[PDB]
Amino acid sequence: DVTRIERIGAHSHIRGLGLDDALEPRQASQGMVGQLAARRAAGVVLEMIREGKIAGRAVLIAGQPGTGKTAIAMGMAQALGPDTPFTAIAGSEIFSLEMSKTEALTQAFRRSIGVRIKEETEIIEGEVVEIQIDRPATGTGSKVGKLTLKTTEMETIYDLGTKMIESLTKDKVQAGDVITIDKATGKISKLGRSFTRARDYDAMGSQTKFVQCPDGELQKRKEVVHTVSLHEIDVINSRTQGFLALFSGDTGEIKSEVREQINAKVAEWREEGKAEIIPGVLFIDEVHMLDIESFSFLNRALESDMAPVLIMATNRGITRIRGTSYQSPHGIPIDLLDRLLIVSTTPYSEKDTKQILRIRCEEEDVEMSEDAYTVLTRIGLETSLRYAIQLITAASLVCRKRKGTEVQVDDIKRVYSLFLDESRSTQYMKEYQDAFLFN
Amino acid sequence: DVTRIERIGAHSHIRGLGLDDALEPRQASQGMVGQLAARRAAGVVLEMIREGKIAGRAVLIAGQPGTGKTAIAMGMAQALGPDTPFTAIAGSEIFSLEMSKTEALTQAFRRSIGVRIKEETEIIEGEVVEIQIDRSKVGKLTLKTTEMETIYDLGTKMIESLTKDKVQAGDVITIDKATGKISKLGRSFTRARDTKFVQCPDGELQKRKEVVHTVSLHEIDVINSRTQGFLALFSGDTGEIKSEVREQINAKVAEWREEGKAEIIPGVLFIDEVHMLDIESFSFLNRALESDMAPVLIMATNRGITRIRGTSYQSPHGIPIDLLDRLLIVSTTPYSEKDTKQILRIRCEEEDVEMSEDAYTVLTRIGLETSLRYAIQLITAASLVCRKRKGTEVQVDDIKRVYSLFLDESRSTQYMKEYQDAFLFN
Amino acid sequence: KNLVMQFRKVCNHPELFERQETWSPFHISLKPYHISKFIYRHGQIRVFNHSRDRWLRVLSPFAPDYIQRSLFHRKGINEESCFSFLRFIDISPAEMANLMLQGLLARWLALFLSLKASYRLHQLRSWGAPEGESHQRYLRNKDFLLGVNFPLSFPNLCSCPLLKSLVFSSHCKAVSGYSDQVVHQRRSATSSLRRCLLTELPSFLCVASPRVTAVPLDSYCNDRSAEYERRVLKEGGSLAAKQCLLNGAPELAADWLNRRSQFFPEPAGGLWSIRPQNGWSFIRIPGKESLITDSGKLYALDVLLTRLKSQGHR
Amino acid sequence: PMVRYCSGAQGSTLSFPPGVPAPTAVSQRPSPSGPP
Amino acid sequence: STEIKKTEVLMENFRRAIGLRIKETKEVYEGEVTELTPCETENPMGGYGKTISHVIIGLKTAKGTKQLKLDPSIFESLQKERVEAGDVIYIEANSGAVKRQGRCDTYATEFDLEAEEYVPLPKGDVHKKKEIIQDVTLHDLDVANARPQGGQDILSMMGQLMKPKKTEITDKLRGEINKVVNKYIDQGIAELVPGVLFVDEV
Amino acid sequence: KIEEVKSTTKTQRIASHSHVKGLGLDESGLAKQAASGLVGQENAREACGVIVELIKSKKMAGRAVLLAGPPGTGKTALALAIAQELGSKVPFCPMVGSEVYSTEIKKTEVLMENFRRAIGLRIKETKEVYEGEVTELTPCETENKTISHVIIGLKTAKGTKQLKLDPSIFESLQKERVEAGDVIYIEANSGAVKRQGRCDTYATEFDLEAEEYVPLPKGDVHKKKEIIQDVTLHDLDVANARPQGGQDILSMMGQLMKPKKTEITDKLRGEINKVVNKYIDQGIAELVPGVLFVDEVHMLDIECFTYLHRALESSIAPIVIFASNRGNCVIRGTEDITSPHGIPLDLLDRVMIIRTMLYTPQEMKQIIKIRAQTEGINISEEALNHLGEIGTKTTLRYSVQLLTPANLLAKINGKDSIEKEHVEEISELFYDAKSSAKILADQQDKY
Amino acid sequence: TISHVIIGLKTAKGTKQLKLDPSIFESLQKERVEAGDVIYIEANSGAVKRQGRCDTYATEFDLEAEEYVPLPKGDVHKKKEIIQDVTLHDLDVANARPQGGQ
Ligand SMILES: Nc1ncnc2c1ncn2[C@@H]1O[C@H](COP(=O)(O)OP(=O)(O)O)[C@@H](O)[C@H]1O
Ligand SMILES: Nc1ncnc2c1ncn2[C@@H]1O[C@H](COP(=O)(O)OP(=O)(O)O)[C@@H](O)[C@H]1O
């Protein structure tokens, strides 16, 4: 019933590259189907990313529009999992007004190297039985006091320190709250009231969800893993109390010496075993948007031990490199195109276009007749794959509007007459050549 | 030996625009050689700057690349010396990302005209012989020169300075009496016992002395623009200074000149490589050269008839005819062989290197074949090859080595043609 | 390698041979920038032009007189008056004048008073609903301040403990984002997983430092009054302005002194509202973990001692 | 010389040492006039 | 835009076209305060001159009067706010903090002038409840996390006196907000209503 | 008897130049055929041999060289070899030509930041400091009252002292919330307090507290030390332009506001030069004028090339290394002026050009071998001969870049080492710039 | 305890008493003026300048951190008719951004 923030998008059916353990692609697996040559190569670079021994590698995924270049990149984004950082950038997103193009690429690079930190801390986790706090009659400002803390199995009294009385009072703990004090940091945290002390109670000083009393021993340990990128480590270090610049995006053009010092101390935290640096991926999707200035930054940014394994999609033939008059392959300068390995995707057949539409209906929660799949496969080769994909939703909705249980060929012949293919819209743009503006 | 910040650069061997008091250039002096036309022309200009009576005046030093147009302007700066404002900026140095291109010239003029004043100041200066303080406060202090001794009952606002700056017996101290700042200079050599040590001051303790101070007209613009303007003078934090603030400061400095209360000290703006100001920037110079507080403008350029920036129009020097009419053009000249050799000699005195007279001969031939600045670079390189060889002096074969290792442009371009399709974008 | 006990010392722990000293930025102080007595006395446009500057303050529509003459003494019934909005923001004509002519101190104190007033406005605005502001017609004072009506405005957010938790980036904390957290019991070795909860960043990510730190470049002058102006500035310009930055408002400084004695004080607002993770100074005392991380033997000894402690061996 | 606040189990409790005022004085509303 | 890059203005409109619809209780105590009555216990605890188990507060509205019993820690907040009898005040039942609105309108005739705006006597009961369903786009969450409004710190006041500049919000904040609203949709607190971004003149 | 052996830390990551360890010259300044990681390029390496003696001589300022030659000829490899040859003690400042295009500061000033950053400086800074447990703390009022003096008691393992200090130090201690029994540090130069923690003598005083308890300091309460600071002229310029030292409310808040760059005025650079010349006269300083390396120089804008005429002629400037991979380009910002290496002829006089040239197949075999054993892989001789063949068919970088995919396939199908069948397979999985430009020109109707 | 301030001024041309309002006296207090300082008051505008201590007190101590200046040789009280030139742009710019006042 309920719908979460992520929903059925252009690639939700993809769940990995669909390789076997011998690194050969299956014909259909994890939602990817066909496209064996590029999926094989994608497996090798994915295994190179997970090996991580080597730096500043680059890959370009070439081929016609609508042939899986972004699909294979999502496939290896999913097969790489959540724990190893993958950054999607569309090539246009570097044109900032906070900062230069070369800053925006340096941030996109360093956002794609993880530093993984285990934080292990003791938490005192308990129901508060009582607090007492003592104030001097006017005094110098020193306090004193005692907690009494409980589980279903334990009780103990703690003689309180003044640097933590200020936190108990700041966060307004009261008898019958359940709390989780991080004893390393001194920080309080509150989990709700225990069920009893809301009965023996004043006119309401609090109203929130209850929680059961904590179990077992009163003093326990917690483990948290943070995957903190080099970019947010630079931003935290760029000024004191910089933490809102992680979300707000406020810091442009971070001082080079901050990066230079973090490149040193992250290497030290590896040699000290304090934090594990993990390589990752920068997917510069549609990279034919980079100005030649930005490509020429990659040429020397891509040659440092702190570079991620970057991947670039492109759909462009021999074209002028953006910001110049120079024609080149992929719209990339040969200075950069020499620094990478090119994986070329290939156009689809019926035998895999039908199979892509078949997995797509299975992700979109749709049933269609085999006659409807046959006609939609024909539309998906008379016209591009993404058009046929989109007709699935409209066909399922048109069928549901007539109270049908399953899509039929006349629902697709309906929808095909109703939402135009570009090539048919471009045809009707001829008979109205006087009426559309600026032909 | 120890290294300055200021090490041996390209122009550093010039220590003045070498001239006789007839404004006549002798063949080589004060570090610089030849240009017997342009050095005399720069001599007349140096006297116009130095006399200062005419305002809004300009000269364009032009000629082939590597014919001293930057060099004679560096020699001119050295001959003008300290204490008469000279500012060199490159033509591309005005293209700010916070401040208008036009305002950056408005500001670059004003760095180069000084306001000079002289202030009579009461300064105490002596060895402190003894110092006592009670428990308000009262205290008593004794001061000495090499020639006299004195005792002073201190006032409260000195006690709260001598105590604040931890002054002790045997220090040498200078005090601006109007303010009580303690400039401690060191300790006397007899009380260095049990880390700067110094002789006690001479003459009497309390001297009235004239302090003469020079503030650029821009340095008066900036002090007036913020709660503490002068920080933005160092930090660059201020740009687009309000034009009515300059309008008032001109009217003020003009009445100080007319009361004789301050003397304005005209100077030089040296807008090096002016060939790439925009037509907008030249249009500002067209009018900013026509105001009584404008400095002498010296401009350097190495361009033929060229498209002026921000336009399709072509004109001499890459400067519009509009601005070339304001100014006097001095042509430098391409060097002869004897001049080229003699320049290479004085560079070797500055590099501190010996080489044989045939080595100077082949180096002169190289310098004529490859436009001088290349031959100057080979001096440095060849001396380093000899130092690797443990040789005392640059012999011809050590130039023939370096001449094979480091290409000039003309050979580099020729060896690039035989790889024409391996390089990108041509 | 570039007689023997030196090797043994270094191989045991390098602090037997060279201790890590406390590093700190190189501290520099340029000579103070010298302004002559003359430019200080005659050269400042804020001073030599003060008589003319009074007319810029007098010929001003922000004078309380002119605000009243425009706001309440119009000729037409309908007529085009500026300052009409001062009837619908809670602003006196003298508060508009003071806010325009007393500078950033009046801005800051009027802002702090507007933060107080926002909660008072929010209550009335979110529970009052009869008829209209008077007999079902007219506006009322404050009714141009609509920025409180947003669900996510700080009063409504503070009033609503679910929405409070969706606005998690408090400006004085190191929040990294959400994660799982695993809790281990000392009994049973059982562990269990807490789903998405807020996390601080680890307290040791903050390690950068300028190689150089400079004393703020200061101006010297040859004049007794110039000394008083710079002394007063270096003391912090007034007790109001200094407390306003240091404690957040002068009311919060007056409270801070006696919040000392209270049980449930509210936070300080100025620079003392912050505690940066190393203190304000960039000086690095070498951490106690450096004893472990500088010797492979001392690290090996620690995995042994923790192994032996877990086994219970003396 | 200490004031003490107990957040207690069956109820809260604030306590003042003898001779400290207990600045918890009562406040009660005084009456207005009949008509304005 | 001149404040923020072209692609980020698209991303903001892609985040305005998705709404939370989140429901919560507001519960509040409000009224003219008729008394503050610290209730002593008949015995103090040993070594103390007197002890208070609760403060009675009398509140009233146009519907009626009642006493409330409140935790003794309230009394400091009742002198932080300059509370005195015949003020009108409120207390958030989910938080226990007390706030002062002003002298009640009943007393507006007790002087010819006084330097405080009188507040009309509240109506409905002293204790109020409603559930209210509040709509925020994910762009509202993105902004409220990118530029905090709870300004009791130097960074927030400085950031609120300075120009309110738009900023290039990071893919990380979008990530953390997607991670939290999924919690509240799964917990059945928040509905999500995906919607439409319409661009004319594309 | 039994042994234990452990080391869990990962290596450094292998980068595209990390086999370069030095120029591989002999003591006479001639090139070895292959040494210190490099192969071939004998003239270009012997020329760099003159330049590394130029740097170590310190005598020159603003001398500059242009490494010029086709893509993949090792230009950045020779400039990295110079960086290794000079060692860490001299600053080598790597820069890319398109980094001058800041949005905070002018192009004609980003170059001066890099020029001032490449001039290193070693300072014998004497710091004098107080540290200990704060056993006592008493501020003193005096008459116009205000706080005017501070009494502090400090304690160490070497006894105790009572020190008398300026009220700015009390305001600093109050800011750091220092209280009795804290352990602190105060350098008297900056007046900078650090709270080290709470003294470990008190670690038993509570059952639960937030503090870091720390052991009592050693040696005297008051002591002086020399720190051998390494610093660059840019670090002096920028630290004075937005000051964060001292302890007033202003420096304390220039530490919070966004750290925007600013167009540093030449008056400040001048006053820094005067100050550091005095540290050099005083024997407190040694100058170490280093190298600026501008990779991809061919896209500095013509504003920048015309600034470099003035910058390279400064008596202060570092030695400058440029690289270009381009022919007779149109120069950026000129609309339609063409010149060699993409650099204006007017600048091209001011540089010693080091021409760098295409490898023979034998130099490619030899680089690929030296590269493979640096990426940590074993390769059979017929496979390496097949990579050498691919080098003749394509380019050095593509040939090198097949190595790690080939090793991935080798370990995936269970081998120890690369066989020719792995390279021959990888050559079909991944296209190159030359072979892609066939399929992409053949199918041109579809993109 | 506040109403207005009587002040006495003296020069080598005579003496006067002025009747300063408390908003002038707030500036004498801010200038750290005391009896025996040499002062310039501009009665239109409340520009108050301390000019150092009168040199009849230049022996109050033997050495003190004040500049001492001779008693003015000019008239105690100078009237000039003056004319202020002020552009509409000065009025705009001096009002549109909150004034310094600092
Ligand atoms: N091999 C594939 N397996 C499954 N779906 C595919 C495959 N190749 C393409 N598609 C689908 O086709 C659509 C367009 O492909 P995409 O990669 O996004 O376009 P493009 O090639 O231009 O980058 C997507 O919905 C994608 O999932
Ligand atoms: N008259 C001269 N005397 C000495 N050296 C000169 C002279 N003229 C040119 N040079 C040399 O010129 C070199 C710098 O180029 P320069 O001639 O100033 O270029 P340009 O004329 O184009 O501005 C310096 O190394 C300097 O030694």
Ligand SMILES: Nc1ncnc2c1ncn2[C@@H]1O[C@H](COP(=O)(O)OP(=O)(O)O)[C@@H](O)[C@H]1O
């Ligand atoms: N002489 C060499 N000896 C060893 N490795 C080299 C040599 N020349 C180039 N390489 C290596 O081959 C690749 C290409 O050289 P590089 O410096 O990147 O060329 P480019 O001049 O185009 O920037 C790099 O991996 C580099 O380290």
